[PDB]
Amino acid sequence: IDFRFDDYVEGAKRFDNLANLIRSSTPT
Amino acid sequence: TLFDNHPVQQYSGFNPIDFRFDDYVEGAKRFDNLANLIRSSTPTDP
Amino acid sequence: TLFDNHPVQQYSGFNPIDFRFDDYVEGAKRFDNLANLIRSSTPTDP
Amino acid sequence: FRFDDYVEGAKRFDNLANLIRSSTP
Amino acid sequence: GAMDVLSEKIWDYHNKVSQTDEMLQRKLHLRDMLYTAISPVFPLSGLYVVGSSLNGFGNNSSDMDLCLMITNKDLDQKNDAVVVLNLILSTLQYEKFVESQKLILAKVPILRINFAAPFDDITVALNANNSVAIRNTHLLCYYSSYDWRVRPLVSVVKEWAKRKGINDANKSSFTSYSLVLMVIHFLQCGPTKVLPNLQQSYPNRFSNKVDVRTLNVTMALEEDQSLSEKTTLGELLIGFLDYYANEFNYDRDAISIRQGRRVERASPHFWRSQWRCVCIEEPFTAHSIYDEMVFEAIKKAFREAHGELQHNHDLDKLMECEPI
Amino acid sequence: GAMDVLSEKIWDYHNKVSQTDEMLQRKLHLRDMLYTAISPVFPLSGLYVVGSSLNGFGNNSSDMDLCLMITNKDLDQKNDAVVVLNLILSTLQYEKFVESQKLILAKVPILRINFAAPFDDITVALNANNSVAIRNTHLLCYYSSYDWRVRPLVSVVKEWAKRKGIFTSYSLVLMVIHFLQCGPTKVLPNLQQSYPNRFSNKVDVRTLNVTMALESLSEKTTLGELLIGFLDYYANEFNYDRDAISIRQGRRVERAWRCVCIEEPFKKAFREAHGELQHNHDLDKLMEC
Amino acid sequence: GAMDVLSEKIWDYHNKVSQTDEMLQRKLHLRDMLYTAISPVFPLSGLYVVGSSLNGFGNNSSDMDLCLMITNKDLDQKNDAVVVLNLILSTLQYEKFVESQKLILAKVPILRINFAAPFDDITVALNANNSVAIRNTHLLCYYSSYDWRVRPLVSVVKEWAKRKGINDANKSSFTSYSLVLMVIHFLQCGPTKVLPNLQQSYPNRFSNKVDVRTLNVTMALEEVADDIDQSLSEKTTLGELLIGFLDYYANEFNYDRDAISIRQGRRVERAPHFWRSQWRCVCIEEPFTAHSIYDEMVFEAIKKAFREAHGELQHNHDLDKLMECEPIK
Amino acid sequence: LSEKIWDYHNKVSQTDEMLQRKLHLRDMLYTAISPVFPLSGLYVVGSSLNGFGNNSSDMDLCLMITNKDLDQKNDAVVVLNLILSTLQYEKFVESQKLILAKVPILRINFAAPFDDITVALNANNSVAIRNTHLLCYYSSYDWRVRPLVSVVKEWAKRTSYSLVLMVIHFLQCGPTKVLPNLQQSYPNRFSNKVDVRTLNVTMALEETLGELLIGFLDYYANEFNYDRDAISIRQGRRVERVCIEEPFTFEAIKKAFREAHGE
Ligand SMILES: [Mg+2]
Ligand SMILES: [Mg+2]
């Protein structure tokens, strides 16, 4: 109410997909 | 002077301090009863 | 309380301190002349 | 302040140096 | 006049300056206010009242000494405690009842606080996590409670000493806490056996291994002292002065409340040195040539006071003395 | 003894210590559990995974650094962050899956959490709204993915320093990125300078591109020459007094506290490590110091 | 209520409260007494007077801040300076003229000393080996001397702020020293250029590099080609400088974006030298080598106090009305 | 295998040449101190005279000024500052350092032909006298002590006064019993009550090397404990309060003694 919160719910779940970004640049 | 009268309020460089909190909340309240112990050893008119 | 209002006066276990004394005696006395600098730049009645 | 006389004391202490040479080997 | 008249003058004076209940309640409420300010930063801590305010020997102008307990681990006092006290300083600055703060260096770091009306007559001294003061406070409270004569005696010894300037909070090594230990030592080891050795008689209650969250604070002490004291209050003050003027040897003797006896000064506990001559062991875990002048003045002030009280039996004459 | 052997050996060491995807999945599950417990206190907050566990550079026993985001303003880390972390500590002390908690007063306060049940091998280090941890992790993850050689290189350099007493993991990673920017072989670019509005400090972190794939002499050089080169660089070329590392500018800079001065995106040991590796090409002999 | 009587009553107030020569002489005599007490323990040391008592900006009730110089090497202040101050405490306790002592943790450890009559109105703050205070005292003392309006402006700003509870030595970050830097900044960077950047114009006199035992304390400043057009400056009255000071900090300065550097001669964008934060909002660089949510309340009181002081003084030009303000809730 | 130990010992021990130089230097110090403390005595203490020193050894000195006990908190520092105030003007003195410690020290370095000798001077701290008086008899009780000590010390390099006490202890307590408890055996000679000016530095006392060293490394690698055991020299035994009580007044250092034994 008196302090200014902001919405990061979706933001934090989306940040996870960096995992895939690394995986998709590792050779097999 | 520029050293003022209080420690630096910014970060100031201290090492990290690992606190494992132990519960002392009720211990501190019970300790007040010492005061009753003093009241009880006091005679009214000796 | 147990802790008083001053550090321990007896030897507390401080680590040894190497002092190489430098001479500052006449320097601290010459610094007072800043007083003249102040007084000589004050107008007597502006 | 009471100073005490250690002049002769200090000099006689030197001859512990003999005690070891008289031992070694 | 009489030893009964002198005994009542001592008692009277005690009641005059002794910490009242109204003051104790006000300090306790102030402690509560500080705790709510501190709580968001240390949510499981507890703010104990330690020293004068609770140990039985306080007077109405005594500081409220506080001890913030945070952790059962040792907290380093050279650096870590300064960080903690500085953090608490930042928190309390926002509070409207807090007017003024300062970090001083005593035997341990100490946060001094002053307050807005209506608490501006109370000063607070806060240390970080030093549970030794809690044990100390616990022990001195049972000493103060064991015999109704202990506290009035300490009340009058304290003021006489203040009026002679050998008890002075702004000068190092001139502490009032040590005077208390000196009285306790006398009532243990002097002619009249008034106080026991509580640490030896009740190891289970005063053990340094007991967690301070479980110290007994309700139960009186179970039964030694024959209670063979038809020694008056007035005799005990005279004897106290006599013992320290004429019987205690400062260069040979040392005081141990915990051992309940005099020990040969040539011998884990910290020994204080009151006025830099009187060696006194803390219950819980070679002089400078310039010290002689002060030692001689302390010894003299005790000889004078004893001579005066032995003669006139007049408490108000004793307290009319001049400083040093 | 031979440098195609050294290259494959470095690679093999990398794959033994690297963070498995199973370990990553477990870490994300535990994060969700933490979030379920934290969400009633901060319903709009975000619990970002930051550091080694996500940026490509972590091993399996690596802490899980987390960043709780609650506000877009900047959270003061002297007072406000301690309070926010104690508000989380007050809730987690009633959760079965959480075992012990330590609050850490530091420049950036940390809530250090240990778990029970099947998660007592994972330690969490949680901060309150220190978004620079998010920016850093984002950037490093694009460095981590830019060239298949960065991570294996980083893996052995981290282990060499551990077994030789030598510097945090994060410092080393930055030493490795800098070397791959400014050494004989130009392997990595200056990403902050090449994609300036994609790694800009001024962007809301909820805007950060997390799926953009970024848009010759380097493919020559092998893993082995890279590592020998790295040790050569810090043994004989980098002045730990005259110079500092700047990542934002892919260049070394005048130092105008710590041994290697490192500016964040947002010595006889090196001598004798280079001596050994350059001469024998034996990774086992290097990390048996 | 007229710009000439505002100027003169600023000057008058300054003269009422400024440190007298008798007071300085009593302080220097007292310092000599302390040095003969300390010299058996530190025989080659020097006891410097630093800060208010010598920097030109002190009043008749300022502490005597003293700096005991012992070595050209650095002395660690966390641990080693405490040993030295405690050793000095031990030595001073045998002195009849010393009444009480106490070790304070300020930005550095500080031995606070009070005295027997006839010196019982002087308090001493003694620091161990912090030569930065000598450089600092030296630099401010030439800012103080550069222009006659500087010191009386500072006297009144200081007292106004005391009365509004904005300058208070018992409260952290509520410093008088900062206010001095704020005035010097204004006189460098406000509408009227009254002061140069002495650190840039005379880097020879004020160099961080120079041994403090060779600091020049006897020579006037040579003039510099075009750094202060000093008669355009003199068109501006004292009274108007005060009003301009209140105006600049109440309505021009952006405390979110701007910071103050006296060494550089300008405001800088908040982006080796320590930065102070006055009231935790006004970031200010020392010439020599994000906000709590609860700070915001206090910030707004500070700004308000300035806005009100500027409104009042600009309207009635009346110094005693300005000074008859009351503190901050 | 004993032989090579004695070689290293006789190679690195203090020469009689060096000791003459130290005594000369000390006499030069005393010539300068004498106007300040006319009745004082300047004793040699430590390695340089107790028989355990190298040639690189500091010369520790003790200025005796009073029969009484000198406070080391304030008086000692004032006394040492009175010497430094004088040595300031002597050409043969190169530099001085005052060391604040539990026992304040004046550390002095010298000019021209005495550059290799450093002096550490304490004020009136006479237990240093006694400790060297006693330890000079321990070094002369058996020919093996001083050579053993030599190798023990440079092994630590590749505190000295404590290395020695550990060595003396092992020769009192371990397998073979080389050295007695001197303080117990001749209680008249080494009494705490003897004035330091009438200590017996003259009369003698009334009544192998290869295996002693490897036995030492055995005694302290897997035979000695650290919080149930301490070292006492005053009483021969192993007692409990590396803890060592002087004649007069951490797993890495076990693994270090352990592998050094596999030789
Ligand atoms: Mg001042
Ligand atoms: Mg108290």
Residue numbers in the entry:
A (entry chain G): 193 to 220
B (entry chain F), C (entry chain E): 177 to 222
D (entry chain H): 195 to 219
E (entry chain B): 544 to 766, 772 to 815, 861 to 878, 883 to 921
F (entry chain C): 544 to 709, 717 to 765, 774 to 814, 868 to 877, 896 to 918
G (entry chain A): 544 to 814, 861 to 878, 883 to 922
H (entry chain D): 549 to 706, 718 to 766, 780 to 813, 871 to 878, 892 to 905
List sentences from the manuscript.
Cytoplasmic polyadenylation drives the translational activation of specific mRNAs in early metazoan development and is performed by distinct complexes that share the same catalytic poly(A)-polymerase subunit, GLD-2. GLD-2 (germline development defective 2) is a highly conserved cytoplasmic poly(A)-polymerase in metazoans. The activity and specificity of GLD-2 depend on its binding partners. In Caenorhabditis elegans, GLD-2 promotes spermatogenesis when bound to GLD-3 and oogenesis when bound to RNP-8.
